């Protein structure tokens, strides 16, 4: 009977900016040109969970390799591999050999991995038509689940469509903008929160910074 | 004689509309993502129920009406209540996780809730066909109905086919237009077939209460 | 020096801009974006012709309903009923529910009713071929022709197929056109071959009487 | 120097210092309603007035009968050009380009024309440009061609080929600056020759193309 | 030894590329219409002749020969003589078209004439698979070549598939560009490769003379 | 600097290791992407040159349009005898141009095992392109190569490469632009993304010269 609540990333600035946190049981999509953070915001979002409230994740990679992605997080000081070990965090891999897809078996497998780990927050990272299909039936299975889920998608242009098929940022409950505009010869990292639907959220472009402890996200408006 | 209006009660759009929606036909409303098209298209049958026990039947193509109905308790309002008290009908013509099979849905609704509002939500040759007899069954019923579409660019197409904006009675586009790193929402009346209006951009937020939209 | 010979519209400022009318026997494109006014255009050149003239004039129409022509022009206070009930006009339904046939149909229409005056309202090789058919038979008629067209940037190609505006022997461009969040309607005549007319955009209002140009 | 043609297009003979080069083929490209055609028109009735050469047009769309009644706004009676046997109107307007170039070729022998207007895949178009220019040169003839373009500051012609194809290359523009027309020439290009460079103001009045170099 | 250059004495464009066109290679000259392709082509093999009594082969594939010459008068250029003296040949290619025939023939003019210098005037995946093979066996033959093409826009695409400026090892660009309702013609030279060159764009006027451009 | 996650090689290539903060990835592939005569062939030539001359790293050059002559006399200019190094069984050039990617692949390992190779360049449906680059760097990384692979790309501010998937699949992005503004040119150097570490961010000038690329951070 309540509006929807939300749950913590603890991302430094991003409580603030969306009002609580991402909204419970839903997914938000997190789209941005190449090297725009991304990874970094699903992998964050996942490490101060288990962290910080002991709410297990799992990863679901499509391209970067597991080893990789624990490799390239330490930039950041977290040891994923150790949160692996003791079953807090499963990177499952659904990456291509490097020798159509079936993302309805592969929905199967999330599941029991989210059943094994018992995890309430999921990233997965990363025809128009066929597009906005399957990514509804992968939204609409992931809230039956229950768990709340970053995905991420990539978009070409800072300030041109939000994903690469103009339809995903209208089957997503949530969306958010990760932008890395060159202004003069400089680079400035934004975030915005376009939409959640159901709740509040600040509006426009926030800068900042990724650091060694991950994004911070500056002092607001 | 001349086409009368029906009040929407959203504050600040029947001063736009010098009155609310033409009676008996369909506005688009189109707007990139989260520019409150669900929200407007809500407000519609809300305020109608609730003003002038007007029932309403919402019909949604996407969003599954538990998700509607949580969504709208954002504004305090209470969607359930509706739908018990057989005020409010939320048609759920959602894809599985015809034009004229949904047509005779909203037919039967229309008569079993005895509903004077309609909410949908959401080649170009077909499009177009299509579009149009979906608009001209409405018109025959009696329904006066708001459309939303979507859009991608916020001063580009009106909607994506190219074809909508031509079919329809009635226009109204929702813009969330970012500018310095900051969000301005507007709302514009483009045309309304055989009446008047007010025209260009207004500005207007989305709180607690809905939409309001300034003059 | 032999001057083509135009008929007034009585549309208010627009026989200035266009020097006496629009050029009789001919057919004059009359393209723009959504709700800019072109169906009202196309009524007022045939209702003026009756009321002022006593040239009967039919409309062709291929979307909207005679039942809301007539309804949505008595926002203007104009009782096309009346003509029709007279024989002064005549509603084409040319709406579904080949060319050769339709052209056949206009032909018999603009006979039994001694019209001077029509409207038609509303791959680009195809349309190209049979616009240009179209355009050569009405005026074999002897026919003085407006033909409504859709476009879909206010300053973009004259009409949707970029072909249109070529094959038409005059071509007159509404706009609507959005700045700082403001509309401002313009209508310019951009051609009429073999004869003389002011250039350039005018602005013009819809209002209770209809277009008002200001020259 | 190469031996040119005057138009007797007022200001044209002074852009493109001293006229059309003689033998070889111009194109002229516009949007709607630039005065292609009546360049067309009055590049042949000002040769035969003037110079007594005779002239074939060459029409794809426009009628002769509306070609002829749009002229005498001008003052200009072709009619009467086409009962002397000076103006000939060929008829290509419809209901092969081999066909076409031995129709034309057949009027200008019979005619004995010196001026010819004719208005108005990438790969066929050019193919298919190219053969025509090609043949009406061997022909003799001097020759405007009109093409159609969709914006003012773009493509010469549709087709992305056309001003390539052609010796010559004028070009009709109608600007909009604010709300207000101007239109003006630009002789582009000149095979072999000189000619003022840039935009020139004209306008259309009772008595055809006036340009102001 | 980095690679050596033959002079154009096209005036000014010999500082600009710091000595000439690099030899042995091609050099895409890329302009929309009217821009002087054709001019820069013919006055790199005239030059060549007048200067150095180095023979040259003109291919051409839309112009006549007669009035590539007829149309060289313009500047004072009397290749009329020059094809009568056997200096200068003009190879006719204009009008299902495959590269390897034309080249046997452009051989073949090249130790017939013992031409020195080349102008060639004038799916994107076939367009550059096939100049890619033209450059290289120019490139075989020894001859130092001037191949003109053409783009639609001032500044856009350096050439019109949006390939040739990838597979050519020389690229010089003439635009046209408008200054009011006035036109600015320039020259760039935009890569030569293993070599130095000036940046960006440089002034210049077809004149009677040709081309004339000032670097400075 | 040391608290950085991932190891790196020096390039050498003054001003690159600073904006880079140390060099290439270890292990990685580097894309360098850049419209006509920006830089990329002499970027990837000197990456491998350096390594040779300052490490005694033997270099592996891939080679699918420029031919191995060429490439060894257009190195000429910046004083660089690659010939003399191909001869001391140092530099391999490996020639794919044009009178299957497994088969290419396996010729760069053969080459790679062959020479005892460290650095590797390569000059030069969407998601066809996509799958077949992203197997291209999953088996180089494989090997353990570190690589500079260019490509193509046709505005100064606009896709990073050609198919608009280049700049994702790989793991370190580096874009050379060539800017005309006011009828000038100046180069620029940037590192959009290195994964795993920080990096200089923006656009660097620099330069072209007898000495190969001079970069200013
Ligand atoms: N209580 C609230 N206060 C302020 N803004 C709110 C509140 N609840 C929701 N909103 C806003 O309303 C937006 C959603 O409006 P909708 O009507 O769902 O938009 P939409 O245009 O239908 O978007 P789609 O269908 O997801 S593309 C959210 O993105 C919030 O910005
Ligand atoms: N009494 C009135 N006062 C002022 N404006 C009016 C009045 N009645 C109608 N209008 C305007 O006239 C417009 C309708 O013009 P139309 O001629 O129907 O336009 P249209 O170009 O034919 O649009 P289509 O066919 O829907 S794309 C409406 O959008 C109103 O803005
Ligand atoms: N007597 C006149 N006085 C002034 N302007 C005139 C006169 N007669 C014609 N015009 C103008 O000339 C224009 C037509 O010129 P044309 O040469 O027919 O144009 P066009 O470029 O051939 O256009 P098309 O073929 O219709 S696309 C008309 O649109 C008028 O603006
Ligand atoms: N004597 C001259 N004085 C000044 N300008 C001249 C002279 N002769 C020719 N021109 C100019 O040179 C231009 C022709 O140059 P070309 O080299 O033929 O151009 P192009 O780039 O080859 O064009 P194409 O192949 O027709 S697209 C003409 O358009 C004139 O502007
Ligand atoms: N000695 C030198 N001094 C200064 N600049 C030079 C020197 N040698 C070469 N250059 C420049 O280096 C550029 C070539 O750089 P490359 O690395 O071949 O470019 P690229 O990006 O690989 O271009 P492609 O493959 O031809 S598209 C030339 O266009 C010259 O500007
Ligand atoms: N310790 C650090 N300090 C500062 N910046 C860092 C640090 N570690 C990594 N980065 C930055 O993080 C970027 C990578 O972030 P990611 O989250 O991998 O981006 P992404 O959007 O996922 O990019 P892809 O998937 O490769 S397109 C690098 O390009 C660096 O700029
Ligand atoms: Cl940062
Ligand atoms: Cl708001
Ligand atoms: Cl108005
Ligand atoms: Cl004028
Ligand atoms: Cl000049
Ligand atoms: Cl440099
Ligand atoms: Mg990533
Ligand atoms: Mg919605
Ligand atoms: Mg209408
Ligand atoms: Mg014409
Ligand atoms: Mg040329
Ligand atoms: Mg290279």
Redesign the interface.
Known sequence: ????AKMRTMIEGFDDISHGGLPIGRSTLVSGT??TGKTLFSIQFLYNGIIEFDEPGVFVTF?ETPQ?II??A??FGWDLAKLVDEGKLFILDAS?D??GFDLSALIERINYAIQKYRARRVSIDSASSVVR?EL??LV??LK?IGATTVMTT?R?EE?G??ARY?VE???S?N?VILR?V?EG???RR?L?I??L????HM???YPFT?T?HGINIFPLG
Request: no cysteine; proline share 6%.
């Open positions: 009977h309540q509006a929807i190449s090297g391209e990789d490799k390239n330490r930039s291509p490097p020798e299909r509804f039936r609409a299975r039956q990539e070409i300030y469509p939000i103009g940022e209208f089957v409950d969306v890395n060159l010869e400089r680079r934004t915005e376009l939409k639907r159901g709740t509040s509006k426009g472009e990724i060694d």
